[PDB]
Amino acid sequence: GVEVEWLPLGEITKYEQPTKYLVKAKDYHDTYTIPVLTAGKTFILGYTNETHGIYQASKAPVIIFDDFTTANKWVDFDFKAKSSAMKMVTSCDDNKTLLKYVYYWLNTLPSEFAEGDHKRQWISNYSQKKIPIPCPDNPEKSLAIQSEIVRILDKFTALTAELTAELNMRKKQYNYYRDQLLSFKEGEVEWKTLGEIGKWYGGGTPSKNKIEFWENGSIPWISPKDMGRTLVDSSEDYITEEAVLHSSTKLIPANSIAIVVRSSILDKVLPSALIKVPATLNQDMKAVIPHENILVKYIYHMIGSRGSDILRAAKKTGGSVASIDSKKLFSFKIPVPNINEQQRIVEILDKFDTLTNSITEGLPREIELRQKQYEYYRDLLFSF
Amino acid sequence: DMQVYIANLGKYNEGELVGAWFTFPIDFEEVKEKIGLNDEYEEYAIHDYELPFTVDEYTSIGELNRLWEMVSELPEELQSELSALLTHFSSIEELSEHQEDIIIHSDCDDMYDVARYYIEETGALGEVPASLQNYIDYQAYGRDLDLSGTFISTNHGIFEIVY
Amino acid sequence: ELHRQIWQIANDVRGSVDGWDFKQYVLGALFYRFISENFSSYIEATDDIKDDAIKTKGYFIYPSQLFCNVAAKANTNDRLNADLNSIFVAIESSAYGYPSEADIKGLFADFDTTSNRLGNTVKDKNARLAAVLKGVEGLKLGIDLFGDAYEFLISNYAAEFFTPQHVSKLIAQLAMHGQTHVNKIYDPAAGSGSLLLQAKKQFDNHIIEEGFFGQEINHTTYNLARMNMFLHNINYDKFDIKLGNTLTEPHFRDEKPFDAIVSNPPYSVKWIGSDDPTLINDERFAPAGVLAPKSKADFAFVLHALNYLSAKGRAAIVCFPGIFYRGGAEQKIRQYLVDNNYVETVISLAPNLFFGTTIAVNILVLSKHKTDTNVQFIDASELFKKETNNNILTDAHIEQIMQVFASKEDVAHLAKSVAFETVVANDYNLSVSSYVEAKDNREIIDIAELNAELKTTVSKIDQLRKDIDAIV
Amino acid sequence: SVSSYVEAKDNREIIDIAELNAELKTTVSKIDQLRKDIDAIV
Secondary structure, three states, X not given: OOOOEEEOOOOOEEEEOOOOOOOOOOOOOOOOOOOOOOOOOOOOOOOOOOOOOOOOOOOOOEEEEOOOOOOEOOEOOOOOOOOOOOEEEEEOOXXXXXXXXXXXXXXXXXXXXXXXXXXXXXXXXXXXXXXXXXXOOOOHHHHHHHHHHHHHHHHHHHHHHHHHHHXXXXXXXXXXXXXXXXXXXXXXXXXXXXXXXXXXXXXXXXOOOXXXXXXXXXXXXXXXXXXXXXXXXXXXXXXOOHXXXXXXXOOOOOOEEEEEOEOOOOXXXXXXXXXXOOOEEOOOEEEEOOOOOOOHHHHHHHHHHOHHHHHHHOOOOOOOOEOOOOOOOOOOEEEEOOOOOHHHHHHHHHHHHHHHOOOOOOHHHHHHHHHHHXXXXXXXXXXO | XXXXXXXXXXXXXXXXXXXXXXXXXXXXXXXXXXXXXXXXXXXXXXXXXXXXXXXXXOOOHHHHHHHHHHHHHXXXXXXXXXXXXXXXXXXXXXXXXXXXXXXEEOOOOOHHHHHHHHXXXXXXXXXXXXXXXXXOOHHHHHHHHHHHOEEEEOOOOEEEEOO | OHHHHHHHHHHHOXXXXXXXXXXXXXXHHHHHHHHHHHXXXXXXXXXXXXXXXXXXXXXXXXXXXXXXXXXXXOOOOOOOOOOOOOOOOOOOOOOOHHHHOOOOOOOOOOOOOOOOOOOOOOOOHHHHHHHHHHHHHOOOOOXXXXXXXXXXXXXXXXXXXXXXXXXXXXXXXXXXXOOOOOOOOEOOOOOOOHHHHHHHOOOOOOOOXXXXXXXXXXXXXXXXXXXXXXXXXXXXXOOOOEEOOOOOOOXXXXXOOOOOEEOOOOOOOOOOOOOOOHHHHOOOOOOOOOOOOOOOOOHHHHHHHHHOOOOOOOEEEEEOOOOOOOOHHHHHHHHHHOOOOOOOEEEEOOOOOOOOOOOOOEEEEEOOOOOOOEOXXXXXXXXXXXXXXXOOOOOXXXXXXXXXXXXXXXXXXXXXXXXXXXXXXXXOOOOOOOOOOOOOOOOOHHHHHHHHHHHHHHHHHHHHHHHHHHOO | XXXXXXXXXXXXXXXXXXXXXXXXXXXXXXXXXXXXXXXXXX
């Protein structure tokens, strides 16, 4: 780690543009082979590789996405196209570079390289200079000692990829398992029609010009952008405790559940969170308290479980931002067992999705901590 | 295509008018046998030309062949639109500097198509939800790219001088 | 709250057609409304809202000099708006000639191109005058921008340049400093010069000297911008605006080498040279060396701006950020601007802070008042670039921007002055310095490590008991 | 036209493929985790 010099960027680099691509087709079906890899993620599906001049053959180049972003980096892994913004980067000297080295060495500086703000091309910025390189250990032992850490960092990137993969596998498996099990329950479980278990609420909208009733206090004001999470005891917004004079809301206990009726459903599955403080909410969304025949976690996950069908229950009720009514959100028979039978199966259900989901005691949190320690050790490492 | 009426400065008033058209490459002795001489050497009176660009009245014939070799160097779709491209530039070696820096659009025909290409198929933003599918102002996007980018509207397409 | 009411009236008078023809209604009615306020208040001393032949044009020639009209002694907003079924037709294009021509003196022609005499029907037309100008007759106070509706009728498509007033306030408070001088003021390529209104009607008792010789292309835009300032007592006796294109006609070329100017150069300002006339060999493009191309001729305007310049008085312009130095086609141009400090300072802004750009611009402040050092005293944000309902008096920043512009205040997370030779050492940064240190976190190995370790060890037995419960 | 609007794009899979992928990727993850622990070189 002694003989380390800055080196210019385009020195060892064979930077080039994409050549004459005729990638302007209409269908990219998976029976075809080569990925039409564009910006964002590195995969739109297959295309015919025959007689289209797709490069595909060095088994380790890299790229730059995007024009005007310059941050999306991908190693050109196997046999890949030249799809419409793939400004190609490989090396001239293929004795020193080992460009997954320099694939990392781009993101060793995200503070000047990987910031995409405006409509500017950055040819001088990635072209000229600099990069700290263990030259003049070139090429021999530089690639050798950097091969150690690149093996480590490739295993860390592999860790990232596989943890995302098993996250998706676990989510898909468990979501299958939610309704494979716990459905059709026998016998005979009561077909309780919706909302009848407890007096669910509507909400109530305040006046935002009431500055006393908008800034002070500590009742968490819940929005559908505060929604989408899970077990939100307190929201981001802290509206006034005296705001209940001019808000027409509903006071809730520590064991309430929430539901939205606008702006994202009619297309997808409904958000839901366990609200656990006295908190208030508008007419953009609603709240349910159950009553005694129940378990409020079982009610919560009965909503989330039947989400694929209770989207369909009161489904359209207008093609606007206006969406699912209260009517057939009150009007569907679901299996609701006796109070001795909720707790075990919803305990397993709660146990699994608190294994998976957000945030603390959660796989994606773990992924983000490993992301942080990855970037930290990359900073730690290339401080030579 | 690309031929000049060049003779002669002898009898300056376009007397001794000889030498009809000379396609490239053009030689001193070829034109000299075409015209004879005016008892001395005062020739290549540039007065007429089928050229896709602007040439001067006293340009030497070696410079003419130089210009032609720069023309033949360039691709033919650019040779068709040299008149439009040279408006932004001033010379051809200047054009040969950034001859790599031209984005060609046979596919895009107005600014609207440029916006739809750089948004949709380029994927400059990723998600196109069906609730958001119509709702991408290609007109204003083309206005903003027209403010930023150097664009040239031609016959064969749109040429973007990006640096 | 009052402007809420005036705002709702501005919304509702838009029913049922747009302000292209309502231009004529608003301008003529508000114009004679201003006359019946001011000119008639001169001849109150208590008699008439219903004005009559009491003007005495032999002695009322003084507002025909000063207000530049005797408008309508017998054709008032009361003496034209009463009824249905009269004679005759024609009251809105041609023959209010004695205020429209009004040659004696200081006439400033195309002054009354809105509504004089014609005319389509009998009193569908003149009862349209009666009913609509009577419903506008009573639109009371509920007066500085009392055509806020007119500041929204010109902003009807604007909810391309239609004077964003926060940017206008920024230019006027960034016209400061070194300003109590003569002249006051010049403006090339003005357009809707209400930026001149908050530049001088704000500075009215401060200093008021000379006329504002703007120059725009669109003739209707020209005329509305001319009478716009005059709506709210900005005098047009002699303080006027010239018409034309600014490079083919940079009048006044003689009067004078100006001292303090402002402008917003728009787009649609390009032109073809380079140059076919003797502007190839003029006073401003021969110092440029290379000349303004067919498209990027925005850079001619600063060449125009130094043409009208003195060393003490400073000049604020703006350009959309297609200037780094724009290659060798403009490098020497940039090099001419750094031949000396012809350009003094630059300031960046934030996208949007305009009407739908959403780009920043670059403010270029030019004086031959040198130190000498290169200035990069810029600040992108903040500049709270949301809207005009938070930080409305100051942005909490115009004093701070003012102080940075005052003397060399070199604050971090903000760019500072560099060497004059640094810009020719570098390849003409505009502007890359400084952009200091956003989002650079750092954590503890132990804290990031043991917490992950604990939560994994939670997750392992969660996985095992999950496999237990994965059994049917 | 709420009646009928019949039920597009409904899919489900089989347990065993998912759970075998699950256990194999967890084993890969565990050997990578202890390998990372080796890589925890301070």
